[PDB]
Protein backbone atom coordinates (compact mmCIF):
# COMPACT_ATOMS: atom_id res chain seq x y z
CA UNK A 1 0.00 0.00 0.00
CA UNK A 2 1.26 3.54 -0.94
CA UNK A 3 1.08 5.83 2.13
CA UNK A 4 0.55 9.50 1.05
CA UNK A 5 0.68 10.68 4.67
CA UNK A 6 -2.14 13.22 4.37
CA UNK A 7 -2.28 15.86 7.11
CA UNK A 8 -3.58 19.42 7.31
CA UNK A 9 -2.53 22.23 9.61
CA UNK A 10 -4.96 22.56 12.52
CA UNK A 11 -5.06 24.36 15.88
CA UNK A 12 -4.33 21.02 17.55
CA UNK A 13 -1.14 20.25 15.55
CA UNK A 14 -0.03 23.87 15.07
CA UNK A 15 2.55 23.93 17.87
CA UNK A 16 4.27 20.76 16.66
CA UNK A 17 4.08 22.07 13.07
CA UNK A 18 5.79 25.34 14.11
CA UNK A 19 8.48 23.63 16.11
CA UNK A 20 9.27 20.98 13.50
CA UNK A 21 9.31 23.50 10.61
CA UNK A 22 11.75 25.55 12.66
CA UNK A 23 13.87 22.48 13.32
CA UNK A 24 14.06 21.50 9.65
CA UNK A 25 14.77 25.09 8.52
CA UNK A 26 17.50 25.42 11.22
CA UNK A 27 19.17 22.27 9.95
CA UNK A 28 19.02 23.59 6.36
CA UNK A 29 20.52 26.93 7.47
CA UNK A 30 23.35 25.21 9.32
CA UNK A 31 24.08 22.82 6.44
CA UNK A 32 24.13 25.55 3.74
CA UNK A 33 26.38 27.75 5.92
CA UNK A 34 28.81 24.92 6.53
CA UNK A 35 28.81 23.95 2.81
CA UNK A 36 29.58 27.53 1.73
CA UNK A 37 32.26 27.99 4.42
CA UNK A 38 33.97 24.71 3.47
CA UNK A 39 34.39 26.05 -0.07
CA UNK A 40 35.02 29.68 0.70
CA UNK A 41 36.89 29.80 3.99
CA UNK A 42 38.27 26.53 5.30
CA UNK A 43 37.94 22.86 4.54
CA UNK A 44 38.53 20.72 7.62
CA UNK A 45 40.50 23.47 9.32
CA UNK A 46 42.86 24.02 6.38
CA UNK A 47 42.72 26.01 3.13
CA UNK A 48 39.30 26.43 1.58
CA UNK A 49 38.04 23.77 -0.81
CA UNK A 50 38.03 26.47 -3.54
CA UNK A 51 41.77 27.00 -2.96
CA UNK A 52 42.37 23.22 -2.91
CA UNK A 53 40.52 22.56 -6.16
CA UNK A 54 42.09 25.50 -8.01
CA UNK A 55 45.59 24.49 -6.89
CA UNK A 56 45.12 20.80 -7.72
CA UNK A 57 48.54 19.92 -6.35
CA UNK A 58 47.98 16.42 -4.95
CA UNK A 59 45.55 13.51 -4.82
CA UNK A 60 42.69 13.34 -5.58
CA UNK A 61 43.26 16.35 -7.91
CA UNK A 62 46.82 16.45 -9.15
CA UNK A 63 46.20 18.26 -12.44
CA UNK A 64 43.75 20.59 -14.09
CA UNK A 65 42.77 17.64 -16.31
CA UNK A 66 41.76 15.66 -13.20
CA UNK A 67 39.63 18.58 -12.04
CA UNK A 68 37.97 18.89 -15.47
CA UNK A 69 37.26 15.16 -15.71
CA UNK A 70 35.50 15.46 -12.32
CA UNK A 71 33.58 18.52 -13.57
CA UNK A 72 32.41 16.70 -16.71
CA UNK A 73 31.67 13.43 -14.86
CA UNK A 74 29.45 15.28 -12.40
CA UNK A 75 27.57 17.05 -15.23
CA UNK A 76 27.00 13.62 -16.83
CA UNK A 77 25.86 12.23 -13.48
CA UNK A 78 23.12 14.79 -12.98
CA UNK A 79 21.92 14.31 -16.57
CA UNK A 80 21.70 10.59 -15.79
CA UNK A 81 19.92 11.15 -12.49
CA UNK A 82 17.34 13.53 -13.94
CA UNK A 83 16.52 11.33 -16.93
CA UNK A 84 16.67 7.87 -15.53
CA UNK A 85 15.70 8.44 -11.86
CA UNK A 86 13.84 11.70 -11.32
CA UNK A 87 11.78 11.31 -14.52
CA UNK A 88 12.44 7.64 -15.31
CA UNK A 89 11.50 6.00 -12.02
CA UNK A 90 7.99 7.46 -11.92
CA UNK A 91 7.59 6.77 -15.65
CA UNK A 92 8.58 3.10 -15.41
CA UNK A 93 6.40 2.55 -12.31
CA UNK A 94 3.45 4.12 -14.14
CA UNK A 95 3.89 2.07 -17.34
CA UNK A 96 4.06 -1.13 -15.22
CA UNK A 97 0.59 -0.28 -13.84
CA UNK A 98 1.93 0.97 -10.46
CA UNK A 99 0.38 4.31 -11.17
CA UNK A 100 -0.28 5.51 -7.62
CA UNK A 101 3.23 4.56 -6.52
CA UNK A 102 4.42 6.56 -9.57
CA UNK A 103 2.50 9.68 -8.62
CA UNK A 104 3.92 9.71 -5.08
CA UNK A 105 7.48 9.05 -6.30
CA UNK A 106 7.80 12.39 -8.13
CA UNK A 107 10.49 14.60 -6.54
CA UNK A 108 9.14 18.14 -5.88
CA UNK A 109 5.50 17.24 -6.62
CA UNK A 110 4.17 18.72 -3.39
CA UNK A 111 4.78 22.18 -4.86
CA UNK A 112 4.17 21.11 -8.52
CA UNK A 113 7.79 22.17 -8.98
CA UNK A 114 9.33 19.02 -10.55
CA UNK A 115 9.62 20.45 -14.07
CA UNK A 116 11.35 23.59 -12.86
CA UNK A 117 13.54 21.64 -10.41
CA UNK A 118 14.81 19.24 -13.06
CA UNK A 119 15.24 22.04 -15.61
CA UNK A 120 17.39 23.93 -13.06
CA UNK A 121 19.45 20.80 -12.68
CA UNK A 122 20.14 20.95 -16.44
CA UNK A 123 21.00 24.66 -16.12
CA UNK A 124 23.61 23.57 -13.58
CA UNK A 125 25.30 21.73 -16.45
CA UNK A 126 24.97 24.83 -18.64
CA UNK A 127 26.62 26.94 -15.94
CA UNK A 128 29.49 24.48 -15.55
CA UNK A 129 30.10 24.34 -19.31
CA UNK A 130 29.75 28.12 -19.85
CA UNK A 131 31.75 29.24 -16.78
CA UNK A 132 28.97 31.54 -15.69
CA UNK A 133 25.56 31.83 -14.03
CA UNK A 134 23.74 34.26 -16.21
CA UNK A 135 23.86 32.44 -19.55
CA UNK A 136 26.97 34.27 -20.84
CA UNK A 137 29.71 31.99 -22.52
CA UNK A 138 32.73 33.11 -20.51
CA UNK A 139 36.12 33.53 -22.16
CA UNK A 140 37.53 31.09 -19.60
CA UNK A 141 35.13 28.17 -20.02
CA UNK A 142 35.13 24.63 -21.33
CA UNK A 143 32.79 25.87 -24.07
CA UNK A 144 35.33 28.42 -25.31
CA UNK A 145 38.16 25.86 -25.22
CA UNK A 146 36.13 23.25 -27.13
CA UNK A 147 34.84 25.91 -29.60
CA UNK A 148 38.46 26.76 -30.47
CA UNK A 149 39.48 23.10 -30.92
CA UNK A 150 36.32 21.53 -32.37
CA UNK A 151 33.51 23.96 -33.02
CA UNK A 152 31.17 21.15 -34.17
CA UNK A 153 31.55 19.33 -30.84
CA UNK A 154 30.91 22.53 -28.87
CA UNK A 155 27.77 23.28 -30.86
CA UNK A 156 26.48 19.74 -30.33
CA UNK A 157 27.05 20.00 -26.54
CA UNK A 158 25.35 23.39 -26.31
CA UNK A 159 22.44 22.10 -28.38
CA UNK A 160 22.11 18.98 -26.20
CA UNK A 161 21.99 21.04 -23.01
CA UNK A 162 19.32 23.24 -24.47
CA UNK A 163 17.34 20.36 -25.86
CA UNK A 164 17.17 18.60 -22.44
CA UNK A 165 16.07 21.78 -20.66
CA UNK A 166 13.39 22.52 -23.24
CA UNK A 167 12.19 18.88 -23.29
CA UNK A 168 11.63 18.95 -19.50
CA UNK A 169 9.78 22.27 -19.79
CA UNK A 170 7.63 20.82 -22.54
CA UNK A 171 6.20 18.22 -20.15
CA UNK A 172 2.70 19.48 -19.40
CA UNK A 173 2.50 21.12 -15.97
CA UNK A 174 2.57 19.37 -13.56
CA UNK A 175 4.73 16.40 -14.45
CA UNK A 176 3.07 14.36 -11.70
CA UNK A 177 -0.26 14.48 -13.63
CA UNK A 178 1.38 13.71 -17.00
CA UNK A 179 3.82 10.94 -16.23
CA UNK A 180 2.97 8.69 -19.25
CA UNK A 181 2.99 11.60 -21.73
CA UNK A 182 4.96 11.57 -24.96
CA UNK A 183 6.71 14.64 -23.58
CA UNK A 184 7.97 12.63 -20.58
CA UNK A 185 9.28 10.48 -23.28
CA UNK A 186 10.74 13.40 -25.22
CA UNK A 187 12.27 14.79 -21.97
CA UNK A 188 13.84 11.41 -21.11
CA UNK A 189 15.13 11.11 -24.70
CA UNK A 190 16.69 14.61 -24.58
CA UNK A 191 18.33 13.95 -21.20
CA UNK A 192 19.78 10.67 -22.53
CA UNK A 193 21.30 12.46 -25.56
CA UNK A 194 22.80 15.10 -23.30
CA UNK A 195 24.13 12.58 -20.86
CA UNK A 196 25.83 10.84 -23.73
CA UNK A 197 27.33 13.96 -25.36
CA UNK A 198 28.92 14.96 -22.02
CA UNK A 199 30.32 11.70 -20.71
CA UNK A 200 31.37 10.29 -24.08
CA UNK A 201 32.12 12.91 -26.76
CA UNK A 202 33.36 15.64 -24.37
CA UNK A 203 35.46 13.86 -21.76
CA UNK A 204 37.23 11.69 -24.37
CA UNK A 205 38.07 14.69 -26.51
CA UNK A 206 39.62 16.58 -23.56
CA UNK A 207 41.48 13.50 -22.26
CA UNK A 208 43.13 12.81 -25.66
CA UNK A 209 46.65 14.39 -25.38
CA UNK A 210 46.73 14.79 -29.15
CA UNK A 211 44.03 17.44 -29.01
CA UNK A 212 46.33 19.75 -27.03
CA UNK A 213 43.66 21.05 -24.61
CA UNK A 214 44.44 19.12 -21.44
CA UNK A 215 47.52 20.88 -20.12
CA UNK A 216 47.43 22.98 -16.97
CA UNK A 217 48.20 25.97 -19.22
CA UNK A 218 44.94 25.41 -21.07
CA UNK A 219 42.74 24.13 -18.24
CA UNK A 220 43.86 26.07 -15.17
CA UNK A 221 41.89 29.19 -16.15
CA UNK A 222 38.85 27.03 -16.85
CA UNK A 223 39.09 25.50 -13.31
CA UNK A 224 39.66 28.87 -11.66
CA UNK A 225 36.71 30.49 -13.43
CA UNK A 226 34.45 27.54 -12.67
CA UNK A 227 35.21 27.69 -8.96
CA UNK A 228 35.18 31.48 -8.60
CA UNK A 229 32.21 32.31 -10.88
CA UNK A 230 30.03 29.20 -10.72
CA UNK A 231 30.55 27.02 -7.66
CA UNK A 232 31.36 29.49 -4.84
CA UNK A 233 28.75 32.08 -5.90
CA UNK A 234 26.08 29.42 -6.14
CA UNK A 235 26.85 28.22 -2.62
CA UNK A 236 26.96 31.86 -1.39
CA UNK A 237 23.47 32.37 -2.84
CA UNK A 238 22.30 29.10 -1.26
CA UNK A 239 23.57 30.20 2.15
CA UNK A 240 21.91 33.62 1.88
CA UNK A 241 18.63 32.20 0.66
CA UNK A 242 18.52 29.37 3.28
CA UNK A 243 19.07 32.18 5.85
CA UNK A 244 16.07 34.03 4.34
CA UNK A 245 14.05 30.83 4.37
CA UNK A 246 14.78 30.34 8.09
CA UNK A 247 13.47 33.86 8.83
CA UNK A 248 10.35 33.26 6.77
CA UNK A 249 9.67 30.04 8.68
CA UNK A 250 10.15 31.79 12.07
CA UNK A 251 7.63 34.53 11.04
CA UNK A 252 5.15 31.84 9.94
CA UNK A 253 5.54 30.11 13.32
CA UNK A 254 5.14 33.40 15.22
CA UNK A 255 2.19 34.76 13.23
CA UNK A 256 0.58 31.95 11.28
CA UNK A 257 -1.73 32.86 8.36
CA UNK A 258 -2.38 32.02 4.72
CA UNK A 259 -0.18 34.95 3.77
CA UNK A 260 2.64 33.69 6.00
CA UNK A 261 2.48 30.26 4.35
CA UNK A 262 2.64 31.93 0.93
CA UNK A 263 5.65 33.97 2.03
CA UNK A 264 7.49 30.88 3.33
CA UNK A 265 6.68 29.04 0.09
CA UNK A 266 8.11 31.96 -1.89
CA UNK A 267 11.24 31.67 0.22
CA UNK A 268 11.39 27.91 -0.41
CA UNK A 269 11.34 28.37 -4.20
CA UNK A 270 13.92 31.15 -3.92
CA UNK A 271 16.27 28.98 -1.84
CA UNK A 272 15.70 25.95 -4.10
CA UNK A 273 17.04 27.73 -7.16
CA UNK A 274 20.74 27.86 -6.22
CA UNK A 275 20.42 24.35 -4.74
CA UNK A 276 18.95 22.94 -7.95
CA UNK A 277 21.50 24.89 -10.02
CA UNK A 278 24.29 23.27 -7.96
CA UNK A 279 23.41 19.67 -8.79
CA UNK A 280 25.97 19.37 -11.63
CA UNK A 281 28.66 19.73 -8.93
CA UNK A 282 27.68 17.15 -6.32
CA UNK A 283 31.30 16.51 -5.36
CA UNK A 284 33.66 17.59 -2.63
CA UNK A 285 32.02 18.91 0.56
CA UNK A 286 28.41 18.36 -0.46
CA UNK A 287 29.23 14.71 -1.33
CA UNK A 288 30.90 14.02 2.07
CA UNK A 289 29.65 13.20 5.56
CA UNK A 290 26.09 12.71 4.26
CA UNK A 291 25.65 16.43 3.57
CA UNK A 292 23.60 15.98 0.38
CA UNK A 293 21.15 13.54 1.95
CA UNK A 294 20.96 15.80 5.03
CA UNK A 295 19.88 18.66 2.77
CA UNK A 296 17.84 16.98 0.06
CA UNK A 297 16.66 13.43 0.61
CA UNK A 298 13.89 12.05 -1.55
CA UNK A 299 11.72 10.03 -0.92
CA UNK A 300 10.79 10.89 2.65
CA UNK A 301 9.45 8.83 5.54
CA UNK A 302 6.17 10.71 5.23
CA UNK A 303 4.36 8.69 7.89
CA UNK A 304 7.19 9.57 10.33
CA UNK A 305 6.60 13.27 9.59
CA UNK A 306 2.90 12.87 10.35
CA UNK A 307 3.78 11.08 13.64
CA UNK A 308 6.09 14.02 14.53
CA UNK A 309 3.33 16.51 13.77
CA UNK A 310 0.91 14.57 15.99
CA UNK A 311 3.42 14.14 18.81
CA UNK A 312 3.05 15.77 22.19
CA UNK A 313 6.85 16.08 22.53
CA UNK A 314 7.20 18.36 19.49
CA UNK A 315 4.06 20.24 20.63
CA UNK A 316 5.53 20.87 24.09
CA UNK A 317 9.10 21.72 23.03
CA UNK A 318 10.61 25.01 24.22
CA UNK A 319 13.72 26.56 22.58
CA UNK A 320 16.98 27.94 24.12
CA UNK A 321 16.89 31.74 24.24
CA UNK A 322 17.96 33.44 20.99
CA UNK A 323 19.43 30.16 19.69
CA UNK A 324 19.12 29.48 15.94
CA UNK A 325 20.51 25.90 16.13
CA UNK A 326 18.26 22.91 15.53
CA UNK A 327 16.70 21.11 18.51
CA UNK A 328 17.25 17.68 16.95
CA UNK A 329 19.73 16.35 14.38
CA UNK A 330 16.93 14.65 12.50
CA UNK A 331 17.13 11.59 10.26
CA UNK A 332 17.82 12.21 6.56
CA UNK A 333 14.36 11.07 5.46
CA UNK A 334 12.51 13.52 7.74
CA UNK A 335 14.66 16.61 7.10
CA UNK A 336 15.91 18.67 4.19
CA UNK A 337 14.28 20.73 1.50
CA UNK A 338 11.56 18.20 0.75
CA UNK A 339 10.46 17.88 4.39
CA UNK A 340 10.05 21.64 4.53
CA UNK A 341 8.26 21.41 1.22
CA UNK A 342 5.82 18.86 2.74
CA UNK A 343 5.23 21.24 5.66
CA UNK A 344 4.59 24.25 3.41
CA UNK A 345 2.67 22.88 0.41
CA UNK A 346 -0.17 20.59 -0.45
CA UNK A 347 -1.16 19.48 -3.97
CA UNK A 348 0.79 22.23 -5.72
CA UNK A 349 -0.35 25.20 -3.58
CA UNK A 350 0.72 26.80 -0.31
CA UNK A 351 -1.00 25.28 2.69
CA UNK A 352 -3.79 27.21 4.38
CA UNK A 353 -4.80 27.61 7.98
CA UNK A 354 -8.21 26.26 9.06
CL1 LIG B 1 5.05 17.94 -10.31
Numbering used by the authors: 31 to 384
How is this structure described in the published paper?
The PIBO monomer is a V-shaped, all helical structure consisting of two domains, D1 (residues 33–90 and 244–384) and D2 (residues 91–243), with molecular dimensions of 73 Å×55 Å×42 Å. The functional site of PIBO is likely located at the domain interface and supported by the clustering of conserved residues, including the buried GxHxxE motif. As a result, our structural evidence clearly argues against PIBO being a metallopeptidase.
The asu of the final model contains one monomer (A, residues 30–384), two chloride ions, two glycerol molecules, and 533 water molecules. In crystal form 2, a glycerol is found in place of the magnesium. The αO-αR insert (defined as the region between αO and αR) of PIBO adopts different conformations in the two crystal forms. However, helix αQ is unwound before residue 361 in crystal form 2, where the peptide changes its direction towards helix αA. These observed conformational changes are likely influenced by differences in crystal packing and environment. The overall conformation of the αD-αF insert in IPPA is structurally more similar to that of crystal form 2 of PIBO. The middle portion of helix αI (residues 215–231) in the second crystal of PIBO displays discrete structural heterogeneity and a helical shift. The two conformers differ by a main-chain shift, resulting in Cα displacements that vary between 0.6 Å and 1.5 Å. Thus, it appears that this region fluctuates between different sub-states, with its conformation affected by crystal packing or other external factors.
